């Protein structure tokens, strides 16, 4: 009946949804592994592709939609020269310092359009050879770089395949002051994480253009998975020989709150789960102690995350955790109107016992 007990009940409800999600993921993994084997056997620019096992499913925070999965295929690309397209670090053009990708160049710039067109062509050919699972490729949607598989098991599962370039060079200068984990996971962890590769994912800017179509966004999905699964100041946080915290529980509740609100109000189309993830990264930095995230504090921790998110909405400021000058809540990206509408809705739920969770 009480507020704290109701929030625990929501987490139970989310726990129950994970069984269908896990079962669907087994089918997705079967298909993805079959497709990757075919891609690794075929001679092409994409022969070196591998699954990057990142994203909400592998972070254990996929809370809904067992019929929709996102999968990343990484391709190592040596000697990438990056050019900032936005000096905030929001977008990059890829250039090079013979080139295996030389067929995808528009002058000196790597064409995401050309490279994705061949990627899609090959995936479509190889998926047709998968004879023992019912799987097809969804017709291409303009503005959507994903190559989407449709699996029927017998129910339909959609799998968005995202091509990600992997660079082993040092991280871009736009990330210099990002990943501010020094007081939480520490300086040794930060140094080790920044020695890992980084990824580039195709994404159109839509603006004055010229090179619209050929821009890429940075991706740190591997780092984010590491942080989600190694999220405590104590190394034993949430391990068998350690103490549970409520960090991931707060993430799941806030993701669910946003997902429920977005279902009801098309005014919220501009918001996405990555805004919640980015906000909770900042909150984990602000409140680094595991004791601040004791399971008994679930309700007060969720409330302080809501308060922090409301402050980001009010100030129209939510910095990308890895790229500090990239403001995800800029007036340019999300109307002041949309932020005020979401602030009103979150405040309502907060002061009335979260009726949208009852749905
Ligand atoms: N607007 C965005 N800006 C930057 N990265 C984004 C954005 N939207 C999604 N991502 C990327 O999505 C990755 C997470 O993949 P995932 O499969 O969890 O997709 P999702 O749509 O964010 O998740 P969910 O289905 O749980 O809501 C993150 O590593 C992040 O880099
Ligand atoms: Zn923990």
Residue numbers in the entry: 144 to 240, 245 to 506
The authors write:
Cyclic GMP-AMP (cGAMP) synthase (cGAS) is essential for the host defense against cytosolic double-stranded (ds)DNA arising from various maladies (e.g., pathogen invasion, ionizing irradiation, and genotoxic chemicals). Upon directly binding to and dimerizing on dsDNA, cGAS cyclizes ATP and GTP into 2′−5′/3′−5′-linked cGAMP, a unique metazoan second messenger for initiating type-I interferon (IFN-I)-mediated inflammatory responses. cGAS is central to antitumor immunity, host defense against an array of pathogens, and regulating autoimmunity. Here, we resolve these numerous fundamental mechanistic questions in innate immunology and present a unifying catalytic mechanism of cGAS. Finally, we reveal how mouse cGAS achieves more stringent substrate selectivity and higher catalytic efficiency than the human enzyme. Together, we set forth a unifying catalytic mechanism of cGAS in which dsDNA-binding pre-organizes the active site into a rigid yet adaptable lock for two sets of keys (substrates and intermediate) necessary to specifically synthesize 2′−5/3′−5′-cGAMP.
Moreover, soaking ATP to QN-mcGAScat crystallized with and without dsDNA showed the productive (one Mg2+) and nonproductive (no Mg2+) binding states seen from WT ± dsDNA (two Mg2+ and no Mg2+), respectively. These observations corroborate that the QN mutant is well-suited for delineating how dsDNA regulates substrate binding.Fig. 2 dsDNA regulates productive vs. nonproductive substrate binding.
